[PDB]
Design a protein around this motif. Structure first.
Motif, PDB file in Angstrom:
ATOM      1  N   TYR A 383     -57.255  96.891  66.379  1.00 35.63           N
ATOM      2  CA  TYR A 383     -57.247  95.553  66.961  1.00 35.63           C
ATOM      3  C   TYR A 383     -55.882  95.227  67.577  1.00 35.63           C
ATOM      4  O   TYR A 383     -54.863  95.836  67.237  1.00 35.63           O
ATOM      5  CB  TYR A 383     -57.514  94.476  65.897  1.00 35.63           C
ATOM      6  N   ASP A 384     -55.879  94.262  68.488  1.00 35.32           N
ATOM      7  CA  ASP A 384     -54.651  93.775  69.101  1.00 35.32           C
ATOM      8  C   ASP A 384     -54.488  92.378  68.499  1.00 35.32           C
ATOM      9  O   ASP A 384     -55.226  91.453  68.847  1.00 35.32           O
ATOM     10  CB  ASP A 384     -54.765  93.661  70.628  1.00 35.32           C
ATOM     11  N   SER A 385     -53.548  92.234  67.572  1.00 34.39           N
ATOM     12  CA  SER A 385     -53.318  90.946  66.935  1.00 34.39           C
ATOM     13  C   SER A 385     -52.231  90.156  67.647  1.00 34.39           C
ATOM     14  O   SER A 385     -51.160  90.681  67.952  1.00 34.39           O
ATOM     15  CB  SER A 385     -52.934  91.147  65.473  1.00 34.39           C
ATOM     16  N   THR A 386     -52.515  88.891  67.919  1.00 34.06           N
ATOM     17  CA  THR A 386     -51.556  88.031  68.587  1.00 34.06           C
ATOM     18  C   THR A 386     -51.186  86.857  67.690  1.00 34.06           C
ATOM     19  O   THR A 386     -52.044  86.259  67.047  1.00 34.06           O
ATOM     20  CB  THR A 386     -52.124  87.491  69.926  1.00 34.06           C
ATOM     21  N   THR A 387     -49.897  86.546  67.638  1.00 34.13           N
ATOM     22  CA  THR A 387     -49.407  85.426  66.843  1.00 34.13           C
ATOM     23  C   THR A 387     -48.549  84.536  67.739  1.00 34.13           C
ATOM     24  O   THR A 387     -47.576  84.992  68.346  1.00 34.13           O
ATOM     25  CB  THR A 387     -48.567  85.908  65.638  1.00 34.13           C
ATOM     26  N   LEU A 388     -48.938  83.268  67.837  1.00 29.49           N
ATOM     27  CA  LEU A 388     -48.216  82.299  68.648  1.00 29.49           C
ATOM     28  C   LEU A 388     -47.461  81.313  67.780  1.00 29.49           C
ATOM     29  O   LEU A 388     -48.026  80.709  66.870  1.00 29.49           O
ATOM     30  CB  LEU A 388     -49.176  81.520  69.549  1.00 29.49           C
ATOM     31  N   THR A 389     -46.175  81.167  68.075  1.00 29.38           N
ATOM     32  CA  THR A 389     -45.307  80.242  67.364  1.00 29.38           C
ATOM     33  C   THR A 389     -45.057  79.072  68.309  1.00 29.38           C
ATOM     34  O   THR A 389     -44.699  79.266  69.472  1.00 29.38           O
ATOM     35  CB  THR A 389     -43.964  80.902  67.016  1.00 29.38           C
ATOM     36  N   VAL A 390     -45.257  77.864  67.806  1.00 30.79           N
ATOM     37  CA  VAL A 390     -45.070  76.664  68.597  1.00 30.79           C
ATOM     38  C   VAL A 390     -44.180  75.646  67.897  1.00 30.79           C
ATOM     39  O   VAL A 390     -44.242  75.482  66.679  1.00 30.79           O
ATOM     40  CB  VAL A 390     -46.436  76.013  68.928  1.00 30.79           C
ATOM     41  N   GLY A 391     -43.346  74.975  68.691  1.00 33.30           N
ATOM     42  CA  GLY A 391     -42.450  73.954  68.177  1.00 33.30           C
ATOM     43  C   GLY A 391     -42.863  72.605  68.732  1.00 33.30           C
ATOM     44  O   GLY A 391     -43.325  72.520  69.868  1.00 33.30           O
ATOM     45  N   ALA A 392     -42.704  71.556  67.929  1.00 29.15           N
ATOM     46  CA  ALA A 392     -43.062  70.190  68.318  1.00 29.15           C
ATOM     47  C   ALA A 392     -42.226  69.248  67.469  1.00 29.15           C
ATOM     48  O   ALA A 392     -42.597  68.912  66.347  1.00 29.15           O
ATOM     49  CB  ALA A 392     -44.552  69.943  68.070  1.00 29.15           C
ATOM     50  N   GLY A 393     -41.091  68.812  68.007  1.00 26.85           N
ATOM     51  CA  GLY A 393     -40.218  67.945  67.240  1.00 26.85           C
ATOM     52  C   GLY A 393     -39.672  68.782  66.095  1.00 26.85           C
ATOM     53  O   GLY A 393     -39.128  69.868  66.321  1.00 26.85           O
ATOM     54  N   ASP A 394     -39.827  68.293  64.868  1.00 32.98           N
ATOM     55  CA  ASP A 394     -39.353  69.019  63.688  1.00 32.98           C
ATOM     56  C   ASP A 394     -40.438  69.902  63.084  1.00 32.98           C
ATOM     57  O   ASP A 394     -40.220  70.530  62.049  1.00 32.98           O
ATOM     58  CB  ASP A 394     -38.864  68.047  62.609  1.00 32.98           C
ATOM     59  N   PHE A 395     -41.598  69.947  63.731  1.00 38.46           N
ATOM     60  CA  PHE A 395     -42.715  70.736  63.234  1.00 38.46           C
ATOM     61  C   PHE A 395     -42.829  72.118  63.859  1.00 38.46           C
ATOM     62  O   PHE A 395     -42.342  72.364  64.954  1.00 38.46           O
ATOM     63  CB  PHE A 395     -44.042  69.996  63.467  1.00 38.46           C
ATOM     64  N   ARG A 396     -43.477  73.021  63.135  1.00 41.06           N
ATOM     65  CA  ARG A 396     -43.719  74.368  63.616  1.00 41.06           C
ATOM     66  C   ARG A 396     -45.224  74.558  63.484  1.00 41.06           C
ATOM     67  O   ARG A 396     -45.815  74.197  62.469  1.00 41.06           O
ATOM     68  CB  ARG A 396     -42.962  75.402  62.777  1.00 41.06           C
ATOM     69  N   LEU A 397     -45.848  75.089  64.526  1.00 41.54           N
ATOM     70  CA  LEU A 397     -47.285  75.303  64.513  1.00 41.54           C
ATOM     71  C   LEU A 397     -47.571  76.760  64.839  1.00 41.54           C
ATOM     72  O   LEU A 397     -46.759  77.437  65.473  1.00 41.54           O
ATOM     73  CB  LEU A 397     -47.971  74.373  65.518  1.00 41.54           C
TER      74      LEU A 397
END
Ligand SMILES: [Zn+2]
Ligand SMILES: [Zn+2]
Ligand SMILES: [Zn+2]
Length: 840
Positions: A383-397
């Motif tokens: 499989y090709d696994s993808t992980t996306l890191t997102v920032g929003a103010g002081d939050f991490r998604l």
């Protein structure tokens, strides 16, 4: 002359005789053939004398007489006898018993071990043989004797301190302990609330992207209430979202090992809904029909031939991309040993669909075994696994995705359903802005530990090396029949009695109740097998420790002895004397008793009430929630945090009891109304009120009674029928002796018909219809109506003998004849003052 070879399994014999043909005579012991049946009575019962250097008294199994016999005469036309049982200590012992039951001289016996069925094995078998290992034999005798002593010496203590019919055992008692500990674990569980927040967003393009909030101010995001969850959503609603990182990485999935007895049971249970016993029944059929290898095994090993056979198949049926460069390797346990092999098809080329001589379920089991065996030797899934890191103010998604690139082994064993990571993620690069669409908060609660299932408990037992492949199923049943645990919705529940016994045993036999007792025993047994210790000495040490514990347990509770059962009273009115009522455990179950039971005859009260429990109904649709909500459903004890378990006392009343009863004495009574069963057994309908009727046991054997507390209509058991209307008109005969027992026969009437029965009916339970000649012999005793049966023709036209039967379709007695116990197909009936006869 001709050589006599002896193996354990018949199927294996037939197969050996083939790859060896005539000149030899192969047969099987079909098991052990022989086994066991200070105080002399106790020693006579045990069959071994711990006080006389362990002298034992083995004796052929009441069901191997023929086998032993037919094996006897065969020893004549035999030149040299070849004992070919398994190389382990049990097999070694079967060989030892055969040699002592067949007699002869040592030189007339030889020991051979068969590697496989291949001629490259059955040949080497007689090539470099040997003789039986006395050390191995004595090691097995030591185990067998230790298990005997414990069961025959501890159980009696239970009969005295707790209740009759109870048992204790090295394997049996820890299996129950496991269920008891899980029960207490669940009842004390307190669900914890936690919240999750997900955010739907749009990429710079316009694509949808779902995100999960993972951190706030760099700390794991895990609000515990709605208020906190709101404070956060308020911030996320106004925040700017931007991509931090996109990690694409190739990941793989690997096939599992071929099956062993424990894993087969678990897989059949999860994918086919099969119970342990059923799975073994189907597996047994498959083995005897030559489709798979022995169903009892603890090794996942595969022979080289087996491995070449499957790779050969994978190569022709899937191609190169599915065939690994070299055989797939697994299991490196340095202490691991070698035994039979893993459970797999005997011929990979045989598909489940071609077994038209097998039940559908056996074909399903075969297919499960087949696919596991072929997938095991195929290549990994990619499989090709993808992980996306997102920032929003002081939050991490975060967002995770996966796209299948190569099925590999999953081609033969598909993914039942897509997983949470089996999804795709839109194209987005670091630094890209994301547009917020919506925020979805979700409330959750931690769930209690899962309850054991039959296969699930087996899994735990094998994990700790507690049982054996051939005994797992048997263990699961014994603990139920003994009344220690019960199964509901295919899940285990500990019964009060199980808790009572488990606590007593842990108190007075800590060593025996330790899960690793078996492992420790195995070490000592290996030492005996390897001339590093002597068996009688090892048993002597064991016995000394055991007797130290047993004697101490025999004493009064104040001296450290075993606590006898304990009455815990409660506010309930005894229907016979109104007094407060207490909660009690017997081998039969858990019940409500009146303290007058402990008062001498003058003031004695024998009234008892059955305690129907409220069965937990786990909702499969709630998934992981289902156990947590069950714990939420329970009341909690006033005096302690422990949960409470619930019982029905009246169609108006309901009773709550603390988990640590009788250590904790909290009780509660509620105007709760539900239904109640007098006991359990053959469901019957009460002719006087239409309510359910069950089967009950007591001081007078077996009777049948109706569950409606307002009706005491009680039927009864009879020799050759399910139930008997109310009660009927009996006549005794001292001149007809019983044959399986020393009793005498009595004649009885009912809707079932007219039958003979033994005077000690609950104990003897002996069954037969009367012969016409018998009735003629006791014709004077027969009540006036029954005389006609004595007039009936005593013998058929062939001169066979005749018996009396009831024609339910016409509500009348008739006479019939039997030869070799089978019906002759002849009958005579009574029709208007005459007897008429003919073919059935
Ligand atoms: Zn009473
Ligand atoms: Zn309590
Ligand atoms: Zn009734």
């Amino acid at each position: 002359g001709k050589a006599l070879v002896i193996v354990e399994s018949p199927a294996k014999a037939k197969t050996i005789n083939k790859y060896l043909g005539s000149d030899y005579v192969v047969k099987s012991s079909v098991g052990h053939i022989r086994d066991l049946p200070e105080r002399g009575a106790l020693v006579n019962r045990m069959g071994v004398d711990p006080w006389h250097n362990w002298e034992a008294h083995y004796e052929v199994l009441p069901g191997k007489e023929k086998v032993v016999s037919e094996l006897k005469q065969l020893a004549e036309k035999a030149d040299h006898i070849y004992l070919a049982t398994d190389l382990d200590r049990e097999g070694e012992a079967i060989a030892w018993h055969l040699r002592e039951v067949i007699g002869g001289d040592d030189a007339r016996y030889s020991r051979v071990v068969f590697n496989e069925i291949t001629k490259n094995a059955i040949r080497q078998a007689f090539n470099k043989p040997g003789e039986l290992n006395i050390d191995r034999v004595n090691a097995q005798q030591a185990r067998r004797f230790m298990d005997r002593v414990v069961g025959y010496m501890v159980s009696p203590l239970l009969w005295k301190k707790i209740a009759r019919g109870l048992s204790a055992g090295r394997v049996q008692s820890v299996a129950v302990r496991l269920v008891v500990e899980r029960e207490r674990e669940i009842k004390a569980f307190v669900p914890e609330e936690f919240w999750e927040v997900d955010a739907s967003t749009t990429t710079p393009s316009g694509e949808a992207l779902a995100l999960q909030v993972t951190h706030q101010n760099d700390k794991p995001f895990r609000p515990v209430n709605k208020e906190q969850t709101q404070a956060a959503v308020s911030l996320l609603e106004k925040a700017r979202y931007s991509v931090l990182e996109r990690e694409d990485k190739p990941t793989t999935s690997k096939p599992g090992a071929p099956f062993i007895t424990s894993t087969l049971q678990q897989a059949a249970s999860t994918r086919l809904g099969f119970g342990v016993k059923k799975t073994m029944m189907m597996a047994q059929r498959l083995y005897e029909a030559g489709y798979i290898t022995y169903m009892r095994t603890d090794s996942t090993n595969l022979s080289q031939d087996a491995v070449n056979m499957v790779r050969g198949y994978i190569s022709d049926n899937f191609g190169k991309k599915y065939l690994p460069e070299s055989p797939n390797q697994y299991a490196s346990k340095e202490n691991s040993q070698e035994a039979h092999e893993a459970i797999r098809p005997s011929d990979v080329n045989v598909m489940a669909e071609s077994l038209k001589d097998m039940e559908a379920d056996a074909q399903k089991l075969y297919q499960l075994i087949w696919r596991q065996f072929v997938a095991c030797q195929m290549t990994p899934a990619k499989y090709d696994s993808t992980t996306l890191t997102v920032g929003a103010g002081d939050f991490r998604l975060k967002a995770r995705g996966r796209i299948l690139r190569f099925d590999g082994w999953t081609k033969v064993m598909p993914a039942l359903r897509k997983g949470d990571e089996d999804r795709i993620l839109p194209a987005v690069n670091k630094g890209d802005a994301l547009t917020l669409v919506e925020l979805t908060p979700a409330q959750h609660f931690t769930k209690p530990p899962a309850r054991f299932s039959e296969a699930s408990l087996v899994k735990e037992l094998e994990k700790r090396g507690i049982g054996r492949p051939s005994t797992y199923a048997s263990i699961i049943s014994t603990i139920q029949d003994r009344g220690y645990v019960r199964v509901e919705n295919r899940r285990f529940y500990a019964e009060k009695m199980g808790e009572i016994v488990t606590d007593r045993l842990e108190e007075n036999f800590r060593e025996l109740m330790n899960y690793d007792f078996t492992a420790q025993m195995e070490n000592s047994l290996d030492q005996v097998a390897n001339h590093e210790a002597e068996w009688k000495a090892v048993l002597d040490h064991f016995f000394s420790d055991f007797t130290q514990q047993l004697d101490k347990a025999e004493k009064d509770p104040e001296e450290g002895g075993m606590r006898p059962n304990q009455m815990v009273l409660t506010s309930i009115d005894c229907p016979t004397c109104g007094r407060k009522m207490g909660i009690r455990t017997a081998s039969t179950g858990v019940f409500l008793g009146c303290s007058g039971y402990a008062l001498p005859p003058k003031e004695r009260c024998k009234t008892t009430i059955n305690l129907v429990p409220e069965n937990e109904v786990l909702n499969v649709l709630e998934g992981e929630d289902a156990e947590t909500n069950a714990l939420r459903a329970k009341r909690r004890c006033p005096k302690c945090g422990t949960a409470m378990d619930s019982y029905l006392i009246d169609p108006k009343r309901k009773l709550h009891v603390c988990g640590n009863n009788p250590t904790c004495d909290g009780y509660e009574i509620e105007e709760g109304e539900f239904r109640i069963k007098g006991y359990d057994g053959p469901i019957v309908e009460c002719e006087k009120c239409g309510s359910e009727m069950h089967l009950k046991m007591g001081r007078f054997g077996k009777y049948m009674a109706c569950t409606n507390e307002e009706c005491k209509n009680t039927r009864k058991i009879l020799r050759n029928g399910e139930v008997a209307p109310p009660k009927e008109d009996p006549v005794p005969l001292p001149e007809l002796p019983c044959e399986k027992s020393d009793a005498y026969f009595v004649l009885r009437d009912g809707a079932a018909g007219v039958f003979l029965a033994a005077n000690t009916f609950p104990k003897s339970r002996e069954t037969r219809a009367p012969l016409v000649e018998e009735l003629y012999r006791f014709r004077d005793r027969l009540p006036e109506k029954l005389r006609y049966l004595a007039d009936a023709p005593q013998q058929d036209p062939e001169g066979n003998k005749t018996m009396v039967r009831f024609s339910r379709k016409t509500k009348q007695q008739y006479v019939s004849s039997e030869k070799d116990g089978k019906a002759t197909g002849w009958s005579a009936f009574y029709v208007d003052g005459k007897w008429v006869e003919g073919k059935k």
